[PDB]
Structure 1
Amino acid sequence: TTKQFSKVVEDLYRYVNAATGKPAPMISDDVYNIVMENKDKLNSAIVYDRDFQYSYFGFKTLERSYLLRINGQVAERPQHLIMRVALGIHGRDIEAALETYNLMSLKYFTHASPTLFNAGTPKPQMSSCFLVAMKEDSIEGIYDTLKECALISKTAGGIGLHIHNIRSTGSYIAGTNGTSNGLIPMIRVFNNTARYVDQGGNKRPGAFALYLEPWHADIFDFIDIRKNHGKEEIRARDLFPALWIPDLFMKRVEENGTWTLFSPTSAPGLSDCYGDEFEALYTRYEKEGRGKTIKAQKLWYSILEAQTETGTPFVVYKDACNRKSNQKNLGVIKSSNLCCEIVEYSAPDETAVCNLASVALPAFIETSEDGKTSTYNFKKLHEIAKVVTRNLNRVIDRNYYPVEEARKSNMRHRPIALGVQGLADTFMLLRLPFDSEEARLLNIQIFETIYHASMEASCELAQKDGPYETFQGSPASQGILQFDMWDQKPYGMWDWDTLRKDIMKHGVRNSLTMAPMPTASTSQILGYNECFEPVTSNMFQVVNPYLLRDLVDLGIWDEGMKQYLITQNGSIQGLPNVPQELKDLYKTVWEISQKTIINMAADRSVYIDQSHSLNLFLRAPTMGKLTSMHFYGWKKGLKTGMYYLRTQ
């Protein structure tokens, strides 16, 4: 189709829905005027040959859901989409747009799907998720919340909703002899609304995540919300249950002690405090017989059966999240998000927003020596991270907010979330086993630099535009950075004294900056493995590109391989003519020590403002196994103990 960018913008901007005779522009007024006023500079900036930097499936993903279409026909070329995003982000700052265009077109990084969809369009909703607070334990608060969720659902983005404050089943209701129906019937109302506000196009069906602390009396039905064999009307098939767990629960379980189930109305404040204060308030309520005591392990057993069967509920630690958040001065954080990476404050008048982008880790690998060997360019990584940090900052300002609570939240705290992809690819290119000592060090270094860089750029922005509204009084304002809250010394590749000094001096423009996300779709566009996890399989059919090369360079790649791989689930262990060095490098996530996965996750966590979507893979899932993985992650101090639990 058409090549000239300014021309594609014209078509997209002048578009009319023929069947209705309604003008339906796919580009904002402001971005259109910016393209027209710089058509020469923008048109001759694009390198159309870079469109060949996408694999078959990569390109297909873009064509299928990303490239803007005109009457069902793809109107945009990948380069067109990238310049649109660049402009949608930087506006009149053309020099900034050109930089983002080249870096993105060269695959150094990319933005989240909502941004690739909507940046530069009339309703530019560029954020990935929203953390919504249940407004009030009332029919009015519940329906105001339902309305808010529906409006948010109109456009792109997932929702995280905490419901700790809702009255449990059988609870008393003043003004009637009836009693509360509890969480399930209310959850089912939300399930139904998620299915109705369907036509976002950009939107993914349900995509709702529910957060609940384990002491809520309706806890047992809540965790079984995704079973496909329940009592039928007690399930919520399109929503995801997530546990907001206090350390107290884990200790009682580990002690094989007791656990008490409370209706929030008969035991107020439990979600409005954490740590020691929560334990004192909980223990006290427990002694006064305000709830129903049970054996901690009884609840625990149901949790593992539910995860083993459905993969849910996710596990995120309430105390670790609150104790180690730079937003702790805002109040108590009552939830995470749909993908368990965002840890931001929310309230009835404030819905936290996810502003995402991921850095392409493999793009920093280079020979730079003599060849054969290859090194990692941390200096370049640092440089790009600062670029992305500025981008996500602009996004906060140019974003279209579906609801006022989301605007209020984002403008006040300006949280940001940089992530990664291609970690596995990186280790593979550098020929480093995922569970090796070298890979462990690289993991630490990469995250240390991205964190230093994001905070450095954020500090520069604070010098230019002032700190975010709630910066004063935050841990960062007192020189307490993320790793300090883990009581560790940074690795040291970068200078933290100077950065910390500058931060205390000038502050930072963003309250948070890190939150490695799943990148399920955006990683598919760049052709790398998802985020920070090992490859799930070494296998239209496509065998691991790196495994292929090596098997060819040994000639050993015949047909007794292509057939093996497909049969043994992309696994090459226990395979005859394959060097040990290759078996060690191309291990599958099912073949890697889940304990090593959790260590590296803990290592990089000291440099993560928020959290990260840690999926756990258990091949032979026994109860005791799954139990030690949870407690191992918990004692490791992780925030997100587990996102999805995948089995096989």
Structure 2
Amino acid sequence: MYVYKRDGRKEPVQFDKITARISRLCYGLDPKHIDAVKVTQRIISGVYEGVTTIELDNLAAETCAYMTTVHPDYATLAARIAISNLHKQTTKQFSKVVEDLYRYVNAATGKPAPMISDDVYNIVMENKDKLNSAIVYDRDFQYSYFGFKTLERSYLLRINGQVAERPQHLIMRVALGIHGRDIEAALETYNLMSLKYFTHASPTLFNAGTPKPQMSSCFLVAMKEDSIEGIYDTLKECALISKTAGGIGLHIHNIRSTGSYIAGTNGTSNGLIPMIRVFNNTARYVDQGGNKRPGAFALYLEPWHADIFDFIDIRKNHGKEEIRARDLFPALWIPDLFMKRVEENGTWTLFSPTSAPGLSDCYGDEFEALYTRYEKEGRGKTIKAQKLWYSILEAQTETGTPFVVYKDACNRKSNQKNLGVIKSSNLCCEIVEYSAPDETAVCNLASVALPAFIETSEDGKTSTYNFKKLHEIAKVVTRNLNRVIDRNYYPVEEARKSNMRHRPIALGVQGLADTFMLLRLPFDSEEARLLNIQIFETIYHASMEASCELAQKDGPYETFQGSPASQGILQFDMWDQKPYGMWDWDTLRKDIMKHGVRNSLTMAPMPTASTSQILGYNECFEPVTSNMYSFQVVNPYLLRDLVDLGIWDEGMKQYLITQNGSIQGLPNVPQELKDLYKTVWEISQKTIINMAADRSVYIDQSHSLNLFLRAPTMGKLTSMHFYGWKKGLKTGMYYLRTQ
């Protein structure tokens, strides 16, 4: 045989070299069952004679995979082939790669187009090899190559159809795309970005220093008036906030339903769904940046609507094709009176929206004094309390929509009740921010991995989590995120209008099913409760004293005369509760009353759309949806843990291709390898609660958390939504994946 190298010649195929390519990259791996012999003996056979080495390395980045069927020491062996292919077409450095891209003249016509900024470009004409002598190109291969089958895919920007970028330049332009002239607090962003401590979210790695920078993550767009005029100033807005990306979560509680009297020529406005299709034809045209991610829009209604029955069974597939709008995601905002209508059992009004002005408004004790008189007069129709509930949950049993939410609690314990009550959330059910005709509150997010602060204690034997590092790293981020609300070139004026005001933010985690299964504390017992409070109680102390120091100097977040932070109050204290105590809470409360804070809303964790992915950690604060991912992926903490006690050779390989992540039924697993790796289908959702009431108290904003089932009944939904409000959950139901 002959091989065609990087030029166009012919290699007599060797066997000590194709795995001197390998037995010298079979490294640090504990190879008790892993060898370079068992490898090229299933590749050489399927090698073409009309396909280049890159196109040969194609099969390998796919072939080294066929071997994780026994031990997790083949992924970084199929990762050392893929990321190695991009080390080819464009040489190693961060300068040249980021060089002939700025001077970029196209094939079609002939005009130089600056792909990249003048910003993250003119802090490198003088500082270039402090950024190539502190950049170790080994950390091009500590990324799990699915995070790189996201990086090649598109994340590493391209030229003439060439992924000229490696991962080590997928981490550094985000250092002086944020900090820049302060190059000093800039590399400290990269430092931990190529170590997996935390990776920045979906959009913060998109355009981090190109010509006209938009870097805010989740928009809370506002509608500006019911009728012909003030609806053309939101039709274009979410559209504009979908040409330059950005998921949205719109609010409507005062637009005239299919019954309301007309303010002109007379007739009737056709209601709520001849709306979710014009906007849907907009929710279905502007592919967020022409052919990128298409546009996704959350929407927020309430049961008191005359067309609350037009809006719930929406994401359903049947029921014609004109009143069903399939891509404008619905979300709840339920009045907590409709709820204390459901359990006692009674009745519930559904006004025709010109029938109640500032009913698009009332909250808590003021909604139980602005609805008590709106029915002793009958300004709509009052339908049952457990029958709309039977169309709320049935919208959820074909589809999943909507997402159960309460209106009072999003301003009760939430930090906004001063500039205007919080009307809208975002695309993802956690950002609790106020929106108006002039005010549009934006958000910037990132994902902090928790399998990145775990270390071996000082007698081998035992190991408690490392609290300092999830804190001394989370200080870097509140200085990473005080340069992102900043350099944001906003597409119009709205996005700008109310992001330079409050400057709100959302911080979370990525690798909870990496940490428990890692810290040798099972996913469901006591050692689980005594670890999740002190992972966020530290974050609410790791991102609020580095915002507490950011008011001595620059000047506070413009509106502070009234916000809880300066009256002996924070968040968890609004939660009828106290703190843990290890962190300095008798002095940090104090730390903000004389000087202040630069941030407003902070703690808001995320499931990470296109982000935990990359880091090779399990998404957000969730375990395993399934242990066999796709194709195939063997759950690794269930392959590092089932090849030693006498339980690996072949057989159980069928124990999961149909069993649906079911190590609940397995033989040679006694009782300490069944509980910790409980698949989400067979773990109880009653007790994902008692620790989320211990992980929602220190949350300025809100949080998005799924509800799971294996055999669906709506009384399980009268004992799963029914267990997320008496405690007082920040969201009743995110999504729902049935069976």
Fold match by TM threshold 0.5: yes
Give the conservation status (yes or no) of the 8 Å contact 2:242–2:288. no
Task: Choose from 412, 416, 422 the match for 1:327.
Answer: 416
Structure 1: how far apart are the matches of 2:498 and 2:106?
Answer: 36
String of CA shifts for 1:131-167, please: whole Å, max 9, x gaps: 1121111211111111111111111210110011111
The structure that has the greater radius of gyration is 2
Compute the displacement of 1:279 (Å): 1.8
User: 1:226 — aligned with what?
Assistant: 315
Compute the displacement of 1:201 (Å): 4.7
Matched residue SS, 1:292: strand
1:491 aligns with 2:580: yes
Structure 2: how far apart are the matches of 1:143 and 1:235?
Answer: 22
Structure 1: how far apart are the matches of 2:105 and 2:566?
Answer: 52
Structure 1: how far apart are the matches of 2:316 and 2:703?
Answer: 26
Structure 1: how far apart are the matches of 2:470 and 2:436?
Answer: 36
1:627 aligns with 2:718: yes
Cα pair distance change 1:346/1:146, threshold 3 Å = same
Superposition TM-score, scaled by structure 1 size: 0.98
Give the conservation status (yes or no) of the 8 Å contact 1:316–1:336. no
Matched residue SS, 1:364: coil
1:288 aligns with 2:387: no
Matched residue SS, 1:7: coil
Compute the displacement of 1:203 (Å): 4.6
Structure 2: how far apart are the matches of 1:416 and 1:203?
Answer: 25
Give the conservation status (yes or no) of the 8 Å contact 1:153–1:203. no
User: 2:194 — aligned with what?
Assistant: 105
Cα pair distance change 1:555/1:400, threshold 3 Å = farther
Cα pair distance change 1:427/1:201, threshold 3 Å = farther
Indicate the structure with greater strand content: 1
Cα pair distance change 1:498/1:131, threshold 3 Å = same
Compute the displacement of 1:417 (Å): 0.7
Compute the displacement of 1:59 (Å): 1.4
Higher mean alpha-carbon deviation, 598-607 vs 443-452, is at 598-607
Matched residue SS, 2:408: helix
Give the conservation status (yes or no) of the 8 Å contact 2:251–2:424. yes
1:589 aligns with 2:669: no
Compute the displacement of 1:372 (Å): 4.9
Compute the displacement of 1:12 (Å): 2.4
Compute the displacement of 1:623 (Å): 0.9
Give the conservation status (yes or no) of the 8 Å contact 1:67–1:76. yes
String of CA shifts for 1:96-128, please: whole Å, max 9, x gaps: 111111111111111111110111112322122
Cα pair distance change 1:223/1:628, threshold 3 Å = same
Structure 2: how far apart are the matches of 1:107 and 1:168?
Answer: 50
Compute the displacement of 1:493 (Å): 2.1
**Number of equivalenced pairs:** 648
Structure 2: how far apart are the matches of 1:8 and 1:182?
Answer: 54
Matched residue SS, 1:459: coil
User: 1:519 — aligned with what?
Assistant: 608
User: 2:121 — aligned with what?
Assistant: 32
Task: Choose from 154, 159, 180 the match for 2:243.
Answer: 154
Matched residue SS, 1:549: coil
Structure 2: how far apart are the matches of 1:213 and 1:465?
Answer: 41
Compute the displacement of 1:15 (Å): 2.2
Structure 2: how far apart are the matches of 1:327 and 1:284?
Answer: 27
Cα RMSD of the aligned pairs, angstroms, is 1.3
Compute the displacement of 1:16 (Å): 2.4
String of CA shifts for 1:544-574, please: whole Å, max 9, x gaps: 1111011112231122222212221122111
Structure 1: how far apart are the matches of 2:531 and 2:105?
Answer: 52
Cα pair distance change 1:18/1:371, threshold 3 Å = farther
Structure 2: how far apart are the matches of 1:20 and 1:219?
Answer: 52
Structure 2: how far apart are the matches of 1:161 and 1:296?
Answer: 25
Structure 2: how far apart are the matches of 1:33 and 1:490?
Answer: 46
Structure 1: how far apart are the matches of 2:155 and 2:538?
Answer: 31
Structure 2: how far apart are the matches of 1:559 and 1:429?
Answer: 25
Structure 2: how far apart are the matches of 1:641 and 1:474?
Answer: 26
Structure 1: how far apart are the matches of 2:355 and 2:709?
Answer: 39
1:176 aligns with 2:265: yes
1:215 aligns with 2:321: no
Compute the displacement of 1:347 (Å): 0.7
Give the conservation status (yes or no) of the 8 Å contact 1:163–1:211. yes
Give the conservation status (yes or no) of the 8 Å contact 2:286–2:295. no
Compute the displacement of 1:366 (Å): 0.3
Compute the displacement of 1:362 (Å): 0.8
Give the conservation status (yes or no) of the 8 Å contact 1:6–1:36. no
Task: Choose from 615, 624, 633 the match for 2:706.
Answer: 615
Structure 2: how far apart are the matches of 1:95 and 1:533?
Answer: 35
Give the conservation status (yes or no) of the 8 Å contact 1:538–1:570. yes
Structure 1: how far apart are the matches of 2:688 and 2:106?
Answer: 51
String of CA shifts for 1:165-201, please: whole Å, max 9, x gaps: 1111121102222211111101111111121112515
Cα pair distance change 1:370/1:120, threshold 3 Å = farther
Matched residue SS, 2:486: helix
Compute the displacement of 1:402 (Å): 2.0
Give the conservation status (yes or no) of the 8 Å contact 1:393–1:416. no
Compute the displacement of 1:470 (Å): 0.9
Structure 2: how far apart are the matches of 1:202 and 1:155?
Answer: 11
Give the conservation status (yes or no) of the 8 Å contact 1:227–1:235. yes
Give the conservation status (yes or no) of the 8 Å contact 1:155–1:203. no
Structure 1: how far apart are the matches of 2:607 and 2:288?
Answer: 24
Give the conservation status (yes or no) of the 8 Å contact 1:594–1:617. yes
String of CA shifts for 1:408-442, please: whole Å, max 9, x gaps: 11110010111101011100101222222111110
Q: Aligned runs of 1:47-58 on 2, under 5 Å?
A: 47-58=136-147
User: 1:309 — aligned with what?
Assistant: 398
Structure 2: how far apart are the matches of 1:203 and 1:123?
Answer: 17
User: 2:656 — aligned with what?
Assistant: 565
Matched residue SS, 1:149: helix
Give the conservation status (yes or no) of the 8 Å contact 1:191–1:239. yes
Cα pair distance change 1:199/1:584, threshold 3 Å = closer
Give the conservation status (yes or no) of the 8 Å contact 2:200–2:445. yes
Q: Aligned runs of 1:87-486 on 2, under 5 Å?
A: 87-198=176-287, 200-201=289-290, 203-486=292-575
Higher mean alpha-carbon deviation, 551-560 vs 234-243, is at 551-560
Give the conservation status (yes or no) of the 8 Å contact 1:156–1:202. no
Matched residue SS, 1:546: helix
Give the conservation status (yes or no) of the 8 Å contact 1:55–1:527. yes
String of CA shifts for 1:54-98, please: whole Å, max 9, x gaps: 112121111112101112210111111211111111111112111
User: 1:67 — aligned with what?
Assistant: 156
Give the conservation status (yes or no) of the 8 Å contact 1:117–1:202. no
Structure 2: how far apart are the matches of 1:17 and 1:635?
Answer: 61
Structure 2: how far apart are the matches of 1:96 and 1:129?
Answer: 25
Cα pair distance change 1:203/1:516, threshold 3 Å = farther
Structure 2: how far apart are the matches of 1:5 and 1:57?
Answer: 23
Give the conservation status (yes or no) of the 8 Å contact 1:152–1:403. no
Structure 2: how far apart are the matches of 1:558 and 1:123?
Answer: 56
Matched residue SS, 1:261: strand
String of CA shifts for 1:517-552, please: whole Å, max 9, x gaps: 110320000000110112111224211111101111
Compute the displacement of 1:360 (Å): 0.8
Compute the displacement of 1:644 (Å): 0.6
User: 1:551 — aligned with what?
Assistant: 642
Matched residue SS, 1:33: coil
Give the conservation status (yes or no) of the 8 Å contact 1:389–1:418. no
Compute the displacement of 1:502 (Å): 1.1
Compute the displacement of 1:202 (Å): 7.5
Structure 1: how far apart are the matches of 2:193 and 2:541?
Answer: 21
Structure 2: how far apart are the matches of 1:144 and 1:493?
Answer: 50
Structure 2: how far apart are the matches of 1:258 and 1:10?
Answer: 67
Superposition TM-score, scaled by structure 2 size: 0.86
String of CA shifts for 1:8-67, please: whole Å, max 9, x gaps: 111222222222322222211021011121012112121110111111212111111210
Indicate the structure with greater helix content: 1
Cα pair distance change 1:372/1:19, threshold 3 Å = farther
Compute the displacement of 1:460 (Å): 0.9
String of CA shifts for 1:373-396, please: whole Å, max 9, x gaps: 322111111111111111112100
Cα pair distance change 1:345/1:202, threshold 3 Å = farther
Give the conservation status (yes or no) of the 8 Å contact 1:260–1:293. yes
Matched residue SS, 1:153: coil
